[PDB]
């Protein structure tokens, strides 16, 4: 499943909330939480946060 998966940002995403994970296309993200609704939580490098699940793709 996506939980615990490693995905890659397909598009740049700029957080709109402090708990969101900004990232650039190509960024590798570790999915740490999956919720239905368009957002997952995960980490990229030293950052953590929610991000649009449709902004990433499985590697």
């Amino acid at each position: 499943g996506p939980l615990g998966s490693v995905v890659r940002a397909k598009f740049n995403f700029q957080q709109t909330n402090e708990d969101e994970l900004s990232f650039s296309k190509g960024d590798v993200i570790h999915v740490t939480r999956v919720e239905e609704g368009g957002w997952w939580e995960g980490t990229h490098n030293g950052r953590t946060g929610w991000f649009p699940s449709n902004y990433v793709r499985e590697i």
Binding site: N17, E18, D19, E36
Partner: peptide
Amino acid sequence: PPVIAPRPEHTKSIYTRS
């Protein structure tokens, strides 16, 4: 870029500050 759904409440916490 793709459409970003509004943050669902079930993904929010007191840390969901804008």
